[PDB]
Amino acid sequence: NYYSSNPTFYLGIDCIIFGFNEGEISLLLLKRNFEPAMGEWSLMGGFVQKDESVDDAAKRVLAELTGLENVYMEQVGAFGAIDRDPGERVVSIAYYALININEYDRELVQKHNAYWVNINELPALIFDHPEMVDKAREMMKQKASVEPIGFNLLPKLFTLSQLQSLYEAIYGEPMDKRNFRKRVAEMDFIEKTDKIDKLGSKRGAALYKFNGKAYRKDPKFKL
Amino acid sequence: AMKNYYSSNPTFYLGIDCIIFGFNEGEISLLLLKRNFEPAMGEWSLMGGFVQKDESVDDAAKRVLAELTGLENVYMEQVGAFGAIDRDPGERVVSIAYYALININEYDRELVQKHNAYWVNINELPALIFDHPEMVDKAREMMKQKASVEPIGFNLLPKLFTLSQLQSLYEAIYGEPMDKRNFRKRVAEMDFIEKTDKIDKLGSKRGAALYKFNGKAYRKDPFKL
């Protein structure tokens, strides 16, 4: 009764999907195999349905591309400039996700014509997607300094050089090897295993694990 | 082929909701509606509205705020998009919450009276309808974080303020007492907080030195207190 004199709008979802590999952060991007903007680069996206909450729409859109569930996700914001989408008025809610770049459904990715691209060497993204990406990076950077969300970008078992390399990539600057390793030593919820990562016959390094339960007993993450 | 790329999807009401912070006599307050309209007439809520066809989401938030307070060029931050299915039991509404910092000594009182709105101490709030309590919590958390790293607090104060008022404000932001001496030191070292030759006079017996925030000077060189 009360709300009907107001207009209604398409509610897009757009996903900034972060991955980490070989000292580089990358985004999972569509090279669109559909109109509008076929052939152009964009974030993975969709629309909110009547079935679902906005949060669940984000989960669904991410699962449609990657097959993943229970993904670490944060809402970035609601982008609502009038002409952000030239085809129609669409207000899009952006989310970012941190996934293990080693674990996703390769079939689904191939069928969406999607690609991992280094975050500092992105092609031109359509619409206001470049803007969304900028805001997502800034928020993730900020959160990753005060909370251990970084470990979602790594496999369950990781080495310290891998971990250092992650934080070097997040902040785009080198870190002192020595004192970084002391910060981890006195961080109790980062447990050292008896397993090693064996890249090759000449390469090995101790594998560590992130202990979620032990972190929440004392949420003192800072590095 | 893309003929129904858009139209195959549903459309939703886009709500606007404003958490409006004020500060006065050492307390942070929120400007709330005791609704004089339905739904939830007689219950307490945030100031609200809906995005229209001619306007962006941010401009909707400005408009809504202006409808209540008459204020423009207000410091505002988008809090988030709240899109749980049943947040509004009457109808499906995805609402985009904003917070605003205003000077409680300057607003349109008849506009506020028209909307039957009242300032309430943020620690002694009435029950708010729908998911408004969740919006306030998130807004408080965000505003607190931002105020430690940027000088957004000065929007809560008059152009001229005493260090006593400033300290009081930050004590209220952080809900804890601060060391008067160390606080004075951090303000003395900030060049963009200029001391004035004016004093705040309450009676003939009360006086205190007034200060000013110089945004120009600040943006030349950025704040931590």
Side-chain angles (χ1 to χ4, degrees), chain A residues 2-177 179-181 183-198 200-212 214-216 218-219 221 223, chain B residues 1-140 142-181 183-219 221-223 225:
Chain A
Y2 319 107
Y3 301 159
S4 74
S5 63
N6 297 288
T8 58
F9 304 91
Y10 295 108
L11 279 186
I13 290 293
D14 284 297
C15 295
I16 297 92
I17 309 165
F18 284 101
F20 177 76
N21 180 243
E22 298 292 6
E24 293 302 324
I25 287 176
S26 301
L27 299 182
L28 190 52
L29 298 176
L30 301 184
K31 193 178 158 65
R32 290 190 163 194
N33 67 8
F34 61 94
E35 216 66 36
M38 186 196 285
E40 306 181 46
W41 293 91
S42 83
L43 303 171
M44 175 52 189
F47 294 87
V48 182
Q49 304 304 311
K50 313 167 97 166
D51 284 14
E52 61 189 6
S53 68
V54 173
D55 288 329
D56 290 347
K59 297 179 162 54
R60 174 179 49 77
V61 168
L62 182 58
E64 291 178 356
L65 176 59
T66 62
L68 294 170
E69 293 189 319
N70 308 118
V71 175
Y72 182 88
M73 280 182 294
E74 286 298 316
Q75 190 193 93
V76 171
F79 293 75
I82 298 177
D83 303 309
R84 61 169 296 277
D85 190 318
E88 188 58 75
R89 178 67 186 278
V90 179
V91 167
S92 185
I93 302 99
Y95 282 78
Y96 76 79
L98 308 181
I99 74 178
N100 182 337
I101 197 169
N102 202 34
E103 284 201 343
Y104 63 86
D105 196 323
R106 277 143 183 83
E107 313 266 61
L108 299 180
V109 169
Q110 281 179 306
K111 268 171 274 187
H112 284 83
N113 205 36
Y115 301 92
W116 286 103
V117 194
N118 186 311
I119 195 155
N120 297 309
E121 291 190 88
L122 297 175
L125 308 179
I126 63 174
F127 305 160
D128 61 349
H129 291 193
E131 183 183 348
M132 300 170 166
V133 165
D134 283 339
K135 200 191 160 61
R137 288 183 73 167
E138 185 64 8
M139 287 179 48
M140 194 270 291
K141 183 184 297 182
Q142 215 287 297
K143 175 88 83 176
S145 53
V146 78
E147 262 180 1
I149 60 168
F151 299 91
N152 292 296
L153 289 167
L154 292 166
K156 182 161 288 188
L157 301 163
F158 53 88
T159 65
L160 295 196
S161 50
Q162 287 167 12
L163 180 62
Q164 185 171 340
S165 181
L166 176 58
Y167 283 78
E168 287 180 344
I170 300 180
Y171 305 150
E173 66 161 27
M175 294 185 72
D176 190 313
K177 191 166 290 179
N179 66 28
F180 173 91
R181 295 186 174 181
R183 298 183 81 84
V184 171
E186 66 201 330
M187 213 168 276
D188 300 359
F189 52 83
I190 299 179
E191 291 162 347
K192 191 187 195 175
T193 73
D194 261 351
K195 296 133 104 73
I196 61 164
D197 200 27
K198 183 190 167 180
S201 68
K202 302 170 164 62
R203 282 172 294 172
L207 280 171
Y208 289 68
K209 175 190 293 196
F210 169 74
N211 186 329
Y215 162 72
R216 291 181 294 271
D218 192 301
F221 178 89
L223 54 81
Chain B
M2 59 162 291
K3 181 167 58 160
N4 299 333
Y5 172 73
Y6 298 95
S7 57
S8 55
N9 295 291
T11 59
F12 303 91
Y13 297 116
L14 269 179
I16 293 292
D17 284 298
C18 297
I19 302 93
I20 305 184
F21 293 103
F23 167 80
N24 166 68
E25 303 284 337
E27 291 161 4
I28 293 177
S29 305
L30 292 183
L31 189 54
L32 309 165
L33 297 194
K34 186 165 186 176
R35 292 188 155 209
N36 60 17
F37 64 101
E38 218 60 82
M41 203 180 305
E43 296 174 58
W44 288 90
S45 87
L46 301 169
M47 184 45 200
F50 292 89
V51 177
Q52 303 302 307
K53 288 180 169 165
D54 64 332
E55 66 184 359
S56 70
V57 168
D58 295 341
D59 283 344
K62 293 174 189 178
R63 169 177 57 77
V64 158
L65 213 108
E67 291 175 0
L68 176 58
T69 66
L71 291 165
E72 306 163 57
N73 304 110
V74 175
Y75 182 83
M76 294 190 337
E77 285 293 314
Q78 185 184 103
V79 169
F82 292 78
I85 295 179
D86 299 322
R87 58 168 296 279
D88 189 313
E91 188 54 62
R92 178 73 193 277
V93 174
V94 171
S95 175
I96 300 172
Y98 283 79
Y99 78 71
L101 309 184
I102 64 172
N103 175 6
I104 198 169
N105 302 282
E106 263 205 1
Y107 66 88
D108 193 330
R109 288 176 284 289
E110 59 193 15
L111 239 42
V112 172
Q113 284 185 331
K114 194 70 66 173
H115 291 76
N116 203 40
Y118 298 89
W119 288 103
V120 189
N121 184 291
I122 199 160
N123 294 317
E124 294 183 81
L125 296 174
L128 301 179
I129 68 175
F130 306 161
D131 60 351
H132 291 190
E134 176 187 354
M135 296 177 165
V136 170
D137 285 339
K138 187 168 170 44
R140 289 183 75 165
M142 284 173 60
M143 190 270 280
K144 190 148 51 172
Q145 174 197 6
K146 184 89 82 162
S148 58
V149 74
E150 281 182 14
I152 60 164
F154 300 101
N155 297 286
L156 289 165
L157 293 174
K159 184 189 182 54
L160 298 170
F161 53 85
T162 69
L163 285 195
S164 186
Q165 289 160 357
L166 185 56
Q167 181 179 342
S168 188
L169 163 64
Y170 275 82
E171 289 185 341
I173 302 284
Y174 302 140
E176 70 165 31
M178 294 179 72
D179 174 74
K180 190 167 297 177
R181 207 152 175 76
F183 184 88
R184 260 62 156 166
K185 278 195 171 70
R186 278 135 89 86
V187 175
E189 301 189 50
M190 282 172 205
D191 297 327
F192 47 82
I193 301 178
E194 299 169 302
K195 193 172 192 181
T196 311
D197 276 337
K198 305 183 86 71
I199 61 166
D200 193 32
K201 314 159 196 181
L202 285 71
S204 66
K205 297 179 180 73
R206 294 196 187 186
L210 288 160
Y211 295 70
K212 186 200 309 186
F213 175 75
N214 195 335
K216 176 82 172 183
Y218 164 77
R219 69 178 55 92
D221 176 23
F223 184 89
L225 62 86

